[PDB]
Amino acid sequence: WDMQNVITLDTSFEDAKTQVQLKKIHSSVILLYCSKDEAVLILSEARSLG
Amino acid sequence: EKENITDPPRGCVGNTNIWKTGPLFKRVLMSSKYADGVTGRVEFNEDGDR
Numbered sequence A: 001w002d003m004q005n006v007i008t009l010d011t012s013f014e015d016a017k018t019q020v021q022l023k024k025i026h027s028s029v030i031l032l033y034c035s036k037d038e039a040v041l042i043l044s045e046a047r048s049l050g
Numbered sequence B: 001e002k003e004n005i006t007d008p009p010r011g012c013v014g015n016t017n018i019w020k021t022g023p024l025f026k027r028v029l030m031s032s033k034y035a036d037g038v039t040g041r042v043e044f045n046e047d048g049d050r
């Protein structure tokens, strides 16, 4: 399995280092493990960042 | 000192909407660095310990 390294979110998004962690993402399948509203926030930031 | 202060409402009477800035105030508690103290220099680590 071509597993990219684990992106870890420690707290709510600073949009300074977490944005870099989103820029480190270049794979195909994104495996997300959070709550529902945090998933809404992460998907909104991913749509905002393309 | 930070902006957009939210308060946990009266959740015991008809309120099931969660307090969304829980992890935000938790991140405020994480970056709480100190040097004064009678017991010593108290400061939270990455797991919130001395």
Ligand SMILES: *[C@@H]1O[C@H](CO)[C@@H](O)[C@H](O)[C@H]1NC(C)=O
Residues within 6 Å of the ligand: B003, B004
């Ligand atoms: C608080 O609300 C304001 C707009 O009223 C906006 O900046 C943001 O959605 C919230 N938090 C911050 C970062 O100030």
Ligand SMILES: *[C@@H]1O[C@H](CO)[C@@H](O)[C@H](O)[C@H]1NC(C)=O
Residues within 6 Å of the ligand: B038, B039, B040, B041
């Ligand atoms: C703990 O040790 C440090 C270094 O000696 C000292 O600065 C601090 O005052 C101590 N805390 C206590 C128990 O007062």
